[PDB]
Symmetry: C6
Subunit: 210 residues, 6 copies
């Protein structure tokens, strides 16, 4: 990644074994649960495009999702090229060529060029642009691998309301609400929630059905 | 987080895999026991609003509590806006716009803006303001998930006083005392504690009933 | 904690996940064995009052002892106030108000004030003052949870002297010696230790009874 | 490796136990799966030829592949010598002799010489040149140890399409595509994929056969 | 410990949780095997007397040995006082009082005084003086807990010579050689070692009896 | 070890618990397999003679090999003294006495002297000289503990060629080749390898017999 040294200069740093290992492990354990997106964004803090490609490549398995991820990256890269056409001309001394979509995705660009963009003044955050494309593609993967629709999350007749709400917002998060939460509650809690009226907080709802 | 480098300047640092992993693990193991609040405050030392949102998002499960947490944040953000209305005008060079509630909660603000507020002179500690809102909301979650009332913590007839006091203050902490501690002691220890008189220390009480 | 950077200035540092985790684990494993006091002092090296309160709060369980710890802190804080009454007056620019007992214990003081005291010239080591109160209170807890009196540590008739001495000084340490060590030895070793005479070293005693 | 200190100078650093251990472990667990190449490139970030040889030597087992790796290195080194013949002459003060293939592969060069090349201005990245040769040789090993041909990856009659696509691109990656993916789908999904037409995305294909 | 910062000044550092934990673990696992002495010396690199006392205090159990260790320290401290009598007089500004035995052992000295001695020019290495006393006392403990005499290490009639030599020098190290190694070899290997003659290396001896 | 600080000065560093622990563990797990030599060289990067002796002393067990290691060190030290006789004379201010063999092996030299040699300009790398002697002695240990001769590595009649080549070069490495690899192949693969002709690569040989 590109970190600021303790003197105030942005320099390149090798990705640490701890960072590499945490990413690999979170995919093995959590696959494409929603909370894998924040881990990816946090672990790739300050990442160059090379670091991002490293992290994606260390994933073994899930190659169907990884391939869908490439197609999303190609979609976003092609959109970047339609909005930012590279102008012909010799690059001035101490300056950087404009990045293409494939340069941001690290396929036609070197690490030294990525460092040049990211440490430019003003910087071209090719790492953050690429990370956004990846998180976009990861969100579609999370959505596709969501097993259950919110319409099928219904409170059991003897299911504690807390457990039901846990399953409800867990499902909702992956599908990516208030009145449906009441409608899918069991008869005994729905009656209590009816009498609470509208505008009740979740805490008030949970307190009323416990 | 925003740390001070070893030269004396406040700079941004990537959240470390150790910090991310410790937070995730403490929620898996301890859920919403009271001691999860100090871990959250310590792990988010110097955190930006983005880091705080990262930590909350890495939580898988407990989505009922996580949703109640958002409602508390929205309550606190809306109160921040009623007390701090943003004034219209162009921001002066080298200065920061006033933060709204949603900027403090990281929903309408960028990392660069959060760094600008937090490293301003004087700084606007949007991270500490947001952390306070979260700890406020976490405390209500801890209180709601407290299973047992202090009125039901009674010493067993052959229960060692030490074990009873352990359960008593554990329950008290989650519910968030002296005379009730005597009243709920078993007959044999209550008689001893009566004769100790008032103003006895816990150490004196424990010594008298062991 | 307040560490000295590699340039020679005392600056504040976030408590590390390693430090937090080690303290929690040592309490889970060792409870209030005597060797938990050195771990606490070493782990809270350079700690502010906030860090000390963090560490104590991360403890789950043992709330009877934790409450006795507060009473010892209140005793010591009140003694600090009787010896150091805060004088009325406006604090001069660049100076710190005198700390009260509750400021040292972090209940009425902010982190910024604690940093001001601890990095003052000369510094007011509110962290070390608070740590002393805590270690004082922890010692009383260790003493109270000591199960066995030294009078009941007697060498078994076929117990190796080494094992006996191990149990003896282990018990002695928690209770917090030479002639009692002989008196509680078994008949066969006591006869040997009699003939050694007084002023023998432990190594001489152990060698004589092995 | 050769890292840039926090002041801006490229200096040599001892390879860390974490880096050494991660490489050894990834070979024990993953052998020569494709994702072992990115781990090798990431763990040897900034590596000198000595560090690269260290990492390869810490591998126990797989000595058949390790020997094939040497033959690839010798092939590449000999090609380097045919393209870069070392010119005779005394090396000027403060300058470095031109590297031979065997100097890049660390067999006829010292660490001090490798540091001289890598920290030269402009630098001769003997580490990156050597790493490229190794990754080249590792790719041939991954290809040779690929057990299954893409022609044998066929969807089972009741196999979920997602699982099939996972096996397909996993196999494809090791062998190192769209129309073959349809042809090897089972009859029921092939009929659906026929009607989708050409130019469908993988996400559209997966959605249509789930 | 007292480390040199990356600028060239000797400053105090908190003992790290890793250092504390490694020492505790090595005592639990290896007790007083000989190789515990090098671990102690390496883990207490640069240690102050306070750090040394911390490490010894974190040991739970083995209190018989720990008490023998104090008696050795008192012996060495008293010898230090007989060779270095403290002269009466006011200490000059910026200078340190001469250390007594009990100051070196950290019982009558503060951390600030230990830092003053250790960072003086020339420094008084009270940490290294104390560490020497401890290693002296630890060596006597290792010697006392050595279970077997070298006279009882005899090669079994079908015991491989390598295994025998392993047990021999292991025992010798704890007891703290060549001709006895031959004498205790079994008849078949002794005959071979006789014919080798004197002045044979261990490698020659092992090769001859394998 | 002697590391270069982030400012460009060679200073001494305490050996880290991670380094100590990794060395101990690799000996417990791998004993004297060949790949233990690279781990030793990597873990002792920049090591002083004291650090090297520390690492060797932390080894418990294998004392037969450890003693053979001392004899190799004494051989090499005595050769160093025959090639570098120390000249009599007072050492000039700011200079270092010439090292003897026993000074390089850390037996008659202090840490401060080792730092003086290693940080001299030009430096006397007593650490690297000592490490070379140790690696020399470790290689003889690896060779002696090699169980199987290369003449006994023969491909089984139904053994996959890959597995055979794995055992072959593993054995060869410890014994420390092409035509013997063919001669020891089973009849079916030998016939194929005959027809390949000479000058075939290992990859061609493996491909032909799979
Ligand atoms: C990936 C990344 C770059 C980012 C970001 C990112 C940025 C901003 C915000 C956010 C912050 C505060 C508030 Cl009050 C709201 C809000 N208040 S509201 C009422 O909607 O108006 N909304 N937001 C999202 C915003 F900004 F997009 F609007 C927020 C979040 C929250 C952070 C958060 C997580 C948490 F657990 C508990 C919290 F209190 C806050 N994360 C989510 O909310 C995810 N989530 N989704 C849903 C669902 F879909 F089911 F409803 C559900 C959640 C849930 F909260 F977990 C919970 C079960 C409900 N994250 S990062 C930093 O992680 O690496
Ligand atoms: C989250 C965060 C930002 C913070 C803070 C924070 C700030 C200040 C203080 C504190 C410090 C010293 C004293 Cl003497 C008192 C006091 N003395 S008193 C008699 O009340 O007048 N009170 N306080 C709270 C104050 F300041 F709010 F008043 C304190 C605490 C204590 C720290 C502490 C924990 C501990 F274990 C043992 C200690 F000796 C001190 N924590 C609590 O006390 C929590 N607790 N709650 C209750 C209950 F409700 F059951 F009674 C019980 C506890 C308990 F102690 F654990 C024990 C069973 C009893 N924490 S952080 C730094 O953790 O990240
Ligand atoms: C908490 C903290 C801030 C502190 C400190 C602290 C400060 C000083 C000293 C100390 C140092 C050297 C000597 Cl020679 C003596 C001494 N010599 S003597 C003969 O008494 O006159 N006394 N002391 C205590 C002093 F200074 F208070 F006097 C010491 C200790 C010792 C350190 C130590 C531990 C150890 F294991 C072995 C050692 F060789 C030295 N620790 C204790 O002795 C604890 N202990 N208690 C008893 C008992 F009660 F049973 F007798 C027993 C021990 C025991 F040694 F473990 C052993 C079974 C016997 N610690 S910290 C740095 O840990 O974080
Ligand atoms: C070793 C090292 C130095 C390097 C590099 C390196 C350099 C660039 C790129 C890359 C980046 C973005 C795009 Cl969009 C494409 C592209 N888009 S495309 C449609 O082809 O035109 N192609 N590339 C390769 C390029 F550049 F060579 F063209 C890329 C990769 C990708 C990174 C990546 C991995 C991932 F998992 C998911 C992603 F979204 C992106 N890695 C691979 O693709 C490996 N892979 N191989 C195949 C197969 F063969 F089966 F098809 C398959 C993959 C797969 F993606 F995993 C997935 C199942 C399919 N890595 S490092 C940095 O790791 O240490
Ligand atoms: C604690 C500390 C501060 C220190 C130090 C310290 C200082 C110097 C030396 C040393 C170095 C090189 C040589 Cl050649 C000799 C030597 N050559 S010789 C022939 O005697 O003349 N002698 N020495 C000791 C010296 F200097 F004191 F003379 C040495 C050692 C050796 C280091 C070593 C360990 C090892 F495993 C293998 C090695 F090749 C070298 N350690 C020991 O030898 C311990 N040991 N003891 C005996 C026994 F008693 F059985 F014989 C046995 C050993 C043994 F080697 F393990 C092996 C089975 C035999 N350590 S530290 C740095 O560890 O933290
Ligand atoms: C200890 C230390 C200081 C050092 C060093 C050190 C220094 C240089 C080299 C080296 C580098 C590149 C090439 Cl191409 C050759 C070469 N090409 S060749 C055809 O012979 O002419 N030779 N060398 C040794 C040189 F330089 F001495 F010649 C090399 C090695 C190789 C590194 C390596 C390991 C590996 F696994 C795979 C590689 F591609 C390269 N290590 C070895 O080869 C060890 N080995 N031994 C044998 C055997 F004996 F069976 F044949 C076998 C190996 C084996 F490769 F593992 C494999 C099964 C065969 N290490 S360190 C840095 O580790 O800490
Ligand atoms: Cl790491
Ligand atoms: Cl790349
Ligand atoms: Cl794969
Ligand atoms: Cl509830
Ligand atoms: Cl980390
Ligand atoms: Cl954010
Ligand atoms: Cl979830
Ligand atoms: Cl009690
Ligand atoms: Cl940490
Ligand atoms: Cl506080
Ligand atoms: Cl609790
Ligand atoms: Cl004994
Ligand atoms: Cl490390
Ligand atoms: Cl090399
Ligand atoms: Cl091997
Ligand atoms: Cl799907
Ligand atoms: Cl640590
Ligand atoms: Cl001390
Ligand atoms: Cl104890
Ligand atoms: Cl042998
Ligand atoms: Cl470490
Ligand atoms: Cl030494
Ligand atoms: Cl041993
Ligand atoms: Cl093969």
């Amino acid at each position: 990644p590109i970190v600021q040294n303790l003197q105030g200069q942005m320099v390149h740093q090798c990705i640490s074994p701890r960072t590499l290992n945490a990413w690999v492990k979170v995919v093995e354990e959590k696959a494409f649960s929603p909370e894998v997106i924040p881990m990816f964004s946090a672990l790739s803090c300050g990442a160059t495009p090379q670091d991002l490609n490293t992290m994606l490549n260390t994933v073994g398995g899930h190659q169907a999702a990884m391939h869908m991820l490439k197609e999303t990256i190609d979609e976003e890269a092609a959109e970047w090229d339609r909005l930012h056409p590279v102008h012909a001309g010799p690059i001035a001394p101490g300056q950087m060529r404009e990045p293409r979509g494939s340069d941001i995705a690290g396929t036609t660009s070197t690490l030294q060029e990525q460092i040049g963009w990211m440490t430019h003044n003003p910087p071209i955050p090719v790492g953050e642009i690429y990370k956004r494309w990846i998180i976009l593609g990861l969100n579609k993967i999370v959505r596709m691998y969501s097993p259950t629709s919110i319409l099928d999350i219904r409170q059991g007749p003897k299911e504690p309301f807390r457990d039901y709400v846990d399953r409800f917002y867990k499902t909702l998060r992956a599908e990516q609400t208030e009145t449906l939460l009441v409608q899918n509650a069991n008869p005994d809690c729905k009656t209590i929630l009816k009498a609470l009226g509208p505008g009740a907080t979740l805490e008030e709802m949970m307190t009323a059905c416990q």
